[PDB]
Amino acid sequence: AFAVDAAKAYKDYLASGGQPITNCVKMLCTHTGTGQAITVTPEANMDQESFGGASCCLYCRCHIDHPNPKGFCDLKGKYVQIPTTCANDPVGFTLKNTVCTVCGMWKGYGCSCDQL
Amino acid sequence: SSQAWQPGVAMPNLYKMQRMLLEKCDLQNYGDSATLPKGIMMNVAKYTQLCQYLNTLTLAVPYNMRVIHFGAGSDKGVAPGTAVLRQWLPTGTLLVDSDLNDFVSDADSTLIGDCATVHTANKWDLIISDMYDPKTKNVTKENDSKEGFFTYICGFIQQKLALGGSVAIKITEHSWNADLYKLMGHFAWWTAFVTNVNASSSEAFLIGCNYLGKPREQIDGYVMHANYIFWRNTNPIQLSSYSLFDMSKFPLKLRGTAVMSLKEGQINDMILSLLSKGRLIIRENNRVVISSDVLVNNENL
Numbered sequence: 001a002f003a004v005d006a007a008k009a010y011k012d013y014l015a016s017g018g019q020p021i022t023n024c025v026k027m028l029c030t031h032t033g034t035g036q037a038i039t040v041t042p043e044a045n046m047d048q049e050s051f052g053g054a055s056c057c058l059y060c061r062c063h064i065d066h067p068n069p070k071g072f073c074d075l076k077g078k079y080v081q082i083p084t085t086c087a088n089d090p091v092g093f094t095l096k097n098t099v100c101t102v103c104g105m106w107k108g109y110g111c112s113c114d115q116l
Numbered sequence: 117s118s119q120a121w122q123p124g125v126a127m128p129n130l131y132k133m134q135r136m137l138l139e140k141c142d143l144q145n146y147g148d149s150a151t152l153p154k155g156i157m158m159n160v161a162k163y164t165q166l167c168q169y170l171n172t173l174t175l176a177v178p179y180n181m182r183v184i185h186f187g188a189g190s191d192k193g194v195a196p197g198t199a200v201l202r203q204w205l206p207t208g209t210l211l212v213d214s215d216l217n218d219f220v221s222d223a224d225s226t227l228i229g230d231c232a233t234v235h236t237a238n239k240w241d242l243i244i245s246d247m248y249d250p251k252t253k254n255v256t257k258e259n260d261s262k263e264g265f266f267t268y269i270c271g272f273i274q275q276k277l278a279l280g281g282s283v284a285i286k287i288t289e290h291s292w293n294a295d296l297y298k299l300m301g302h303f304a305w306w307t308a309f310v311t312n313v314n315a316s317s318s319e320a321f322l323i324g325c326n327y328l329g330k331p332r333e334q335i336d337g338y339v340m341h342a343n344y345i346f347w348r349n350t351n352p353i354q355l356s357s358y359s360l361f362d363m364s365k366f367p368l369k370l371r372g373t374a375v376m377s378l379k380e381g382q383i384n385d386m387i388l389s390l391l392s393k394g395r396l397i398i399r400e401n402n403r404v405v406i407s408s409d410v411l412v413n414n415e416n417l
């Protein structure tokens with residue numbers, strides 16, 4: 001019945017003015033990529049930065065179990081594209097947002113599936 | 117010079133053939149720091165330039181490639197170098213990394229502990245080491261060949277590097293080993309490569325290209341390190357981050373190099389030739405299995 005809620009803890013910490021987790025591993029890349037959210041190689045477009053995935057995962061970075069029932073990580077071993085305007089807090093960004101299962105962009109940061 | 121647009125500078129051949137005595141390393145550009153692109157860590161820049169240089173060599177790049185990365189943790193508790201290696205290497209490359217201290221990593225598997233505790237059932241196509249102990253940088257004592265993790269690395273290469281495979285092992289003025297230089301004579305080609313972003317440091321990567329499993333050349337490692345320091349002492353390298361801004365040709369090309377299993381009796385001159393050209397890897401193609409020895413202690417009462 002008891003399990004630590006790290007996600008809520010980080011959200012509350014940020015809202016109370018805490019400094020975002022640092023040392024997320026930003027990659028060099030062309031910034032001419034697809035802009036998809038989570039990829040096997042850096043895919044930032046001109047509006048994004050690409051980061052090593054594990055370093056942007058709250059559960060990886062805090063040494064805690066992942067929500068996935070098999071403990072799998074969506075980010076470890078991949079690269080995550082973060083909007084440049086949000087690149088000051090990649091952990092917060094990956095935690096607060098969701099990837100469109102159809103086109104692979106971030107909902108509300110590239111996904112246009114709900115516009116046709 | 118025009119070197120400033122390269123990813124770094126490799127030891128010129130003429131320096132490799134000298135017979136220098138070991139001196140202190142006094143770098144003219146010492147203390148200077150390169151201006152890194154906004155938000156980019158030194159170790160990302162450094163690994164990127166290393167990988168850019170390795171793109172110019174005749175690396176064997178098979179399907180089901182296997183790479184192991186020692187010294188991969190940072191004091192930040194992440195693995196920037198592993199992230200660059202995984203970016204560089206073809207998708208699906210099996211990447212294992214390791215360090216003394218715990219860190220979070222993008223590698224397919226990570227072993228925490230002294231490198232001498234690491235064992236693998238399989239052979240490897242590429243070995244990267246950034247292992248380093250800052251306590252070696254002691255200008256007040258004699259600079260002798262170091263053992264420690266270098267002894268492990270030499271044995272690991274001889275036991276677990278596939279024929280045709282390559283290595284890049286970080287050294288410095290004081291962090292070096294004579295047998296490792298001697299082992300560079302067991303590759304088709306070797307160099308000491310200095311990244312342009314860290315050119316004010318005596319750091320280099322000792323690169324062995326295409327392992328032959330036997331001496332092509334007899335190298336005295338004490339003399340070779342003296343030769344390396346003489347080169348550094350007399351050839352100031354201009355700090356430069358230029359190469360970081362052109363990433364279009366960064367990914368290592370998946371050459372699909374052939375992998376065969378062969379017994380030492382079958383390695384003839386024609387095989388040795390193919391190995392030397394980056395055209396052949398010799399090793400079993402079984403599963404990749406690794407382990408870390410753990411010392412058990414009960415210190416109760």
Ligand SMILES: C[S@@+](CC[C@H](N)C(=O)[O-])C[C@H]1O[C@@H](n2cnc3c(N)ncnc32)[C@H](O)[C@@H]1O
Pocket residue numbers: 159186187188189190191195196197198214215216217229230231232246247248249264265
């Ligand atoms: C230059 S740092 C690591 C930098 C890292 N490669 C990166 O990508 O940022 C040197 C590393 O060598 C590791 N190391 C040094 N001696 C070691 C040993 N005997 N066994 C295992 N790791 C060692 C240290 O823990 C340390 O993390």
Ligand SMILES: [Cl-]
Pocket residue numbers: 334335336337339340
């Ligand atoms: Cl020699």
Ligand SMILES: [Zn+2]
Pocket residue numbers: 054057058059060061066073074075076
């Ligand atoms: Zn994770």
Ligand SMILES: [Zn+2]
Pocket residue numbers: 100101102103104105111112113114
């Ligand atoms: Zn969508």
